[PDB]
Ligand SMILES: Nc1ncnc2c1ncn2[C@@H]1O[C@H](CO)[C@@H](O)[C@H]1O
Ligand SMILES: Nc1ncnc2c1ncn2[C@@H]1O[C@H](CO)[C@@H](O)[C@H]1O
Ligand SMILES: [Zn+2]
């Protein structure tokens with residue numbers, strides 16, 4: 001329950017089993033459903049597209065992100081005016097997803113009332129919009145619901161800022177520190193105005209409080225020691241905003257943080273939500289744009305629309321192909337069959353739909369695509385005409401290429417997206433259940449012993465146990481570290497992932513003595 | 516035992532098949548009141564014919580996604596209704612009589628019902644059913660409205676349903692083939708693959724029919740249940756005990772008689 005267990009490739013060039021103590025709070029925060037969902041998403045992504053060379057780097061990054069998430073959750077967990085502010089922000093953070101679902105319900109309730117609007121020239125000749133319902137309570141209900149929806153949108157923004165922004169800032173700072181130390185981006189290379197992220201990150205380097213969310217507070221000293229001899233100690237000190245003379249015994253940071261926040265896509269979406277809610281008080285019918293939130297709210301809707309978005313580039317490109325083909329048909333029509341495009345019953349006033357090239361193209365794109373049999377359903381009958389056979393071929397080819405083939409292509413793209421997503425899911429699951437995540441040894445070897453693979457994955461090579469050991473190392477003092485702990489802590493500090501057992505394990509090393 | 520009878524009857528009335536048969540009888544009784552109530556017994560073909568049950572399994576495999584995308588269609592049509600009721604109300608006059616106009620979008624709920632009714636069922640969308648926008652100030656806006664309605668609702672939102680049905684067909688086929696492949700490539704009891712047993716000709720067939728037959732295991736289980744505990748022999752009493760404490764460690768897993776005595780047998 002609390003006894004941890006991992007295996008590492010120790011300094012003795014042999015697999016060594018390490019025992020550590022896990023805490024109940026960390027176990028609960030790891031068993032939390034949101035952390036479980038994040039774990040599932042990470043596993044799916046890495047198994048699907050993450051390569052084997054960078055797999056464990058991605059795993060360690062995910063472990064660090066999870067550790068920071070559980071730290072934030074522990075901070076916000078609830079056991080003068082500053083106490084009120086801290087308590088209120090913690091309440092919004094713990095109930096952020098409840099408020100987001102609450103806002104969705106208020107969007108449906110408002111839009112249901114909006115179905116009772118009526119328009120009339122006379123007041124209840126600029127027209128008048130009013131609610132037509134006999135009960136007499138739905139207008140005050142709509143007013144109260146609109147005010148409540150705006151309030152809930154504001155609370156959702158505040159809760160997001162309190163809850164999810166710290167993780168984004170932490171990830172940005174971690175990536176920047178890694179680039180400074182192990183890459184020398186600004187020290188040696190520097191971006192070329194193509195990396196707007198790097199250009200914006202230039203600001204925070206000189207700030208005294210560059211590492212705030214990231215744990216490593218010694219990053220500036222480490223990069224200074226690593227790059228001083230090569231790039232000038234004085235130059236490095238100037239770039240990093242620190243003075244050497246102080247060691248003989250933040251508006252800029254706020255600007256950079258707010259730039260990252262306003263670049264964040266989820267924050268931009270919530271800001272758009274709030275803006276549209278505010279426009280709702282100007283025109284209640286602007287609350288209909290909050291029904292689009294169902295796609296981002298419902299996981300079922302998100303998965304269903306993933307079929308459309310999987311091949312969206314091909315869908316728009318084949319729409320362009322359809323436009324080109326219809327333009328070619330328009331060229332042929334405007335050059336040869338102009339007489340058949342008279343859409344006027346009145347004989348005195350003809351309405352020629354193909355006497356202008358753009359008019360004919362618009363007519364085609366409008367009616368021919370939406371017609372069941374093509375443009376021949378909408379244009380004049382060619383019976384008993386000189387160009388009867390040519391026009392028949394024209395209509396038949398239009399129907400076959402545009403109505404049949406060019407829409408079967410779209411439907412097949414959607415169906416292929418469905419099938420490909422299903423196959424990706426099944427492939428990820430099969431690989432996960434047939435091969436060990438850490439060492440990569442197949443279940444065939446471990447299955448010689450009954451329940452051998454299950455025991456090995458739950459106990460010997462548990463990725464949860466590896467994350468727990470990582471955070472145990474991070475929490476524990478460097479001086480208090482024991483031998484193996486300091487060894488693996490060092491290889492974590494230089495980002496060397498050779499301590500993870502790959503291709504072998506305790507059983508594969510000591511099978512002769514164990515059995 | 517009145518309490519036992521009450522509990523038994525509660526379980527019976529909770530049983531789904533018993534509830535279905537009770538509904539069948541109730542509708543048959545209502546048939547004598549109105550013979551046309553006997554039409555509800557034609558729905559029994561789905562539960563009777565295995566072919567029909569398998570065919571309707573394609574619809575029911577993704578039924579949650581089908582109803583959820585129907586709700587998505589409703590939301591999208593509601594958005595189109597909002598846009599129509601706000602901007603293109605003049606095009607929704609469905610009256611040939613000039614003296615009496617029949618405005619289908621002068622009321623919001625009427626316009627939504629009109630959309631849900633005719634626009635979805637129309638071949639080209641709502642533009643097939645509403646007034647022609649030629650020679651109008653909002654001609655291009657209304658053309659974009661109709662084209663987007665046709666593409667999103669008629670094309671994409673029905674291709675989604677058809678693709679869901681087809682994917683259900685394919686997934687059921689793949690599940691069947693996967694189950695069959697696993698069953699014929701691995702032993703049910705011990706889990707050892709057929710590659711080991713196939714060294715001997717017909718080795719896997721002999722092993723599955725004779726050594727590790729699940730039918731034989733069931734027969735032994737019922738033989739133990741029938742036989743007296745006193746009459747049980749040594750191994751029989753041993754396995755009977757581990758059955759009594761629900762311990763399934765007596766089933767051979769990962770090894771068998773051949774894997775144990777291959778050196779002496781061959
Ligand atoms: N190294 C691993 N650690 C944890 N689970 C693993 C590992 N390798 C495979 N799995 C699979 O992941 C699931 C539990 O996380 C199980 O299906 C298990 O077989
Ligand atoms: N342990 C088993 N007992 C019976 N049939 C098995 C077993 N393992 C696999 N099978 C397969 O089941 C079918 C017969 O029940 C055959 O295809 C056979 O190969
Ligand atoms: Zn392993």
Ligand SMILES: [Zn+2]
Pocket residue numbers: 702703704705706707722727771
């Ligand atoms: Zn067997």
